[PDB]
Design a protein around this nucleic acid. Structure first.
Lengths: 80, 118
RNA sequence: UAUCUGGUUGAUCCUGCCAGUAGUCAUAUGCUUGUCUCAAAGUUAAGCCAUGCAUGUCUAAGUAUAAGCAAUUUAUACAGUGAAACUGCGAAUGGCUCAUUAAAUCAGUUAUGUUUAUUUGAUAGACAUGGAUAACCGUGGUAUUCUAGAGCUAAUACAUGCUUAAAAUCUCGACCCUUUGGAAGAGAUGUAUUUAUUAGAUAAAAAAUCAAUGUCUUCGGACUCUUUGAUGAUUCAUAAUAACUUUUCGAAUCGCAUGGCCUUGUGCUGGCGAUGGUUCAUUCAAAUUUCUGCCCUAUCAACUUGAUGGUAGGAUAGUGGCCUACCAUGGUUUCAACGGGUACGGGGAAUAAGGGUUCGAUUCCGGAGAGGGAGCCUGAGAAACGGCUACCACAUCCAAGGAAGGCAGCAGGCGCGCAAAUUACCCAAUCCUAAUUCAGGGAGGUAGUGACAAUAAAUAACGAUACAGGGCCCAUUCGGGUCUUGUAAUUGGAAUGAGUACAAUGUAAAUACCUUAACGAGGAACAAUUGGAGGCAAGUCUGGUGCCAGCAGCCGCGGUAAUUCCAGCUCCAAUAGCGUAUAUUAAAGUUGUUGCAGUUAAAAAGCUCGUAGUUGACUUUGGGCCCGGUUGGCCGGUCCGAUUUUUUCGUGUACUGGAUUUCCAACGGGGCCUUUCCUUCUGGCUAACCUUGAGUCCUUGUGGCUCUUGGCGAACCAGGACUUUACUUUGAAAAAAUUAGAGUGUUCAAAGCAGGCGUAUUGCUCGAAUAUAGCAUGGAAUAAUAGAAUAGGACUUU
RNA sequence: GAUCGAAGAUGAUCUGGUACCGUCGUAGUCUUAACCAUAAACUAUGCCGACUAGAUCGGGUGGUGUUUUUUUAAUGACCACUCGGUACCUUACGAGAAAUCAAAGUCGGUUCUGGGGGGAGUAUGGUCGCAAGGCUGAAACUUAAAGGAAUUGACGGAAG
RNA sequence: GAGAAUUUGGACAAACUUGGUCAUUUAGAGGAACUAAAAGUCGUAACAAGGUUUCCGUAGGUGAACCUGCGGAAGGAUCA
RNA sequence: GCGGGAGUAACUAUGACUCUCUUAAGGUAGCCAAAUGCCUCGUCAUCUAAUUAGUGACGCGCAUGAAUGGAUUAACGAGAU
């Protein structure tokens, strides 16, 4: 996986964990036009909770503190 | 993905499966006439299959006008009309009858001739 | 790298569909039927199954049938210090099948929170005791399954920890203490197996480090908490950061061979091999999870409450909605949710020039299933094909009380069907299972069956002589040369495949034996058929039949002179195969990604307008993001060794070619994104560019001249290094030449080269990270003040 | 509801005449509001931008010369250009099967549409409509061709 | 202190039975249409200017191909 | 107010079409065995222990037919199986 991808926040209510949507730019093989995807990726923030909805955050691997939540976000960039 | 709606090539055969021939218990032996350009009464049989269970009419060529393919004959049925187009003189038939074959081997071969077999 | 033909017409050229030529199939059918090697062989009802077989093995885990005791059986040289019995270990391996599964399945690449019989490395300990119990014996209840009372007996099966002659030395904690020590307990026992700091987190019991009591004291010092938790600290583990990846946990069991001294309650000790309980590794294997890519149908558009997620406990080997209570109202979706239909997936297999299209047999890897539906135990591993229990349907046995069963394991039976093989042989070889011997294996290694296909031999071919006919070269015309549709009791023979007798050879449990030479005998290249003859598509004449009998892939032929029917003779093409049928692909540029048309042949929506979406004129730039490579990791061939070998196997290295398409990194882009100016009296103040291009040197490749071939000068290509003139904000100048000063990124770690010295250290280069007009605002310098960290000095009732 | 007329009613014509023709005449034709929404709805040629010789109508400028003419505005006459629309005509290069085109040659960015004829713009469902009907939209099966461009000749109640 | 059997309570998985709703297949009273096939019936619609030029869309009417109103096209020469 | 008699197509079987008589002159779109049918347990499928209703058609119309109207077609009932 490695490199830091995009990820804007969709769901915000709870403590610690949020959900982000990622986007990619893939070729569909017979078309050779680009597409875009959706993926529900749950991702842990901090016990402080600094994210809002909209924030582009730096994703990367960390501990599974939940089985699906292997990702953490360290640096918040935007605010909404 | 994209493509316009293409249909794959279809053999005009009411039996299907993945089988070359087929058995059939028959109903009747008919002697039907033909279309405009040619006369003569051409022989046929009403073959009903066992596996597929479809009613088809099949042309029976033979060197025997009233050759044995009776009412309850276990006759083997092949192509010819599946392969190529359907026959011009007597239409409807697109199946040809095979000689001395199947499990029981009831339908007889070409008689009264002594050239090589076929 | 790709060659088209025939049929729409009176004829022609386009458009266009159809038919045919080719390669291929677990094949099927007609016909003919002579062999072999190798390979393959239920596609239909994951339908129902009879019978036999597919799961055992050790006595090397023990008492040890002596001493003492019934009956029976086996062995011997004599002793038999005897066994076949009851216990323990495997049945989760291996084999079979694709019902199911658009899936957290599977396929690329990875990631963390676990488990792990057996195997493998290393330390210490391995003491002292107790009670039952089959087998067995005499009896007893049943149709069978299944067993009842009673007596004797072993263990590494099972359960306590009672007893303490003798008992060193060290460490640690409570009770008790003149604090000196004493009583009692638990652990340890020569040499050996990654760290530091911080943030978050569960439970019973015991303990360390401490808070909260209190006491004694020669006042030096030393004692001290039912319970409770930690401001703090310790211990195990994870994350983050300093370089990364993999592996890793919880309560004893002895038996055996050999032997000197010593001791003995006569069962120690020493040496050696092996096992069991703990502690920490290691190898192999299995779990769990993140991200990306997924088939069609939108004549399927709304779906989703244990649903998205947090909080807590509860549960698990562990991460976890795995689960519940409470709270918030979200989550998914046209980038296709959800539903319906269909389907195992990949390495791969066929076809093609490639692009692609169509498939997922055999082999190999992964998942899922064991009559149907349910549940559990046993165990390290199973919610278990040949394990267990209850229930249902079927077929079967039965003394009618009641029992016993599941071939999607092998061989076979019935039914289904175009259709697919023996109720065979065996543990030798390989591999798996159990100290070795050795035993078990319907795994497997083999055999049998069928032109099922490929392959080779292939459907037969020689030296010599006599005679007759037509064509051509040459001819002195007399003949001679070369050459074969016939012919002869022709002559000399030679030759395979197979059988049989004898010899010789290798593995064997069985069926069929291989190879060479001599002699005799038999058969003979083990009987050649199938298909076509109008055009497409090599090949015509005569009789017979008369729209009948018949053939037909296409267009058509047959009703009196039929090259198409039918038979003959007469021809062509291939051959142990030939034709037909199935179906995929090619032909097909006819679903066009590579590689298609729309004035009249089929085809521009009646016309405007506009959203999502797709596309984007343009200057200067680095970073960021994304797409696209090229190179290295696996397999095959070649290289090397053995060998007869280009068979084949094994190891190491290099080169070359092919594949899984996802991650990391370096190097140059393309596409995507960013302003004259800027508080004000007043002075207007302060500062600057990537790069391109040219020159020089060095290195590489090409060509010319020259050498048998290996040398030389010049030009040009590409790469690297070196190189400033230069650029700019300002001052002094009468102007101005000119001149004087300053600048042309920052930070950190290591390694190399470079001044002066041993070094240090500085500068430059190489590689990363980060950012890319200033004066409202923010940082630094400077000053003040508050908090924290670090270093040094003066002090200290520290 | 004037002017002419589907349907409807008589007369004539013919073998028949439910037509052409002649006499009459209803709905329509006109109007407001509302609806259905189609045409052989046409250039049978999508929209937008750049390259390649030759008319006419409107705007703007020039003609140091000539004419109009008595508010002289002549806007003109007639000629030079320069631009947009471009009835269109005609034509070389070039393309195509050809007639022809003058881009329907040829190019891109983007969207629509075609894959033999008959069955079929039908069947059925959905959707819209008051209703006639529109929109979307197949298969069984049948067949071996349908079709375009271009030629020759016979014939005409065709012409010379 | 342990094992077997019985009773009560809690929570989980799936089957079975009944009712409603939707899709598919077969049988099927009955109903509408097409294709192929000789001869027929009635008219001459189309085909030359077929003796009213045709065809297509749409509306009304007729035994019948059809006729008529309205619009348009060249699928009548020529750019109507 | 809206007709009769006679002749006629491969083959069982039928009358497209044609002729003749009579009268003023002889019917369309759409439907059928009726609040109307002599003939008729007609003729066929499905249902039912029998089942003619339910529901599927047949054609054999004594004697269907567009304004004191055919035909499209939703809501409502102390009314009918």
């Amino acid at each position: 996986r490695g490199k830091i991808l995009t990820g804007t926040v969709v769901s915000t209510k709870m403590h610690r964990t949020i959900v982000i949507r990622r986007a990619y730019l893939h070729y569909i093989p017979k078309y050779n036009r680009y597409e875009k995807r959706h993926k529900n990726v749950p991702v842990h923030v901090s016990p402080a909770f600094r994210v809002q909805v909209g924030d582009i955050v730096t994703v990367g691997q960390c501990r599974p503190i939940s089985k699906t939540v292997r990702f953490n976000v360290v640096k918040v960039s935007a605010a909404a | 993905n994209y493509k316009k709606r293409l249909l794959g090539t279809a053999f005009k055969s009411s039996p299907f499966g993945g089988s070359s021939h087929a058995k059939g218990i028959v109903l009747e032996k008919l002697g039907i006439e033909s279309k405009q350009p040619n006369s003569a009464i051409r022989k046929c049989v009403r073959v009903q299959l066992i596996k597929n269970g479809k009613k088809v009419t099949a042309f029976v060529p033979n060197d025997g006008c009233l050759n044995f393919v009776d009412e309850n004959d276990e006759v083997l049925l092949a192509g010819f009309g599946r392969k190529g187009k359907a026959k011009g003189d007597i239409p409807g038939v697109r199946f040809k009858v095979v000689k001395v074959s199947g499990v029981s081997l009831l339908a007889l071969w070409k008689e009264k001739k002594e050239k090589p077999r076929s």
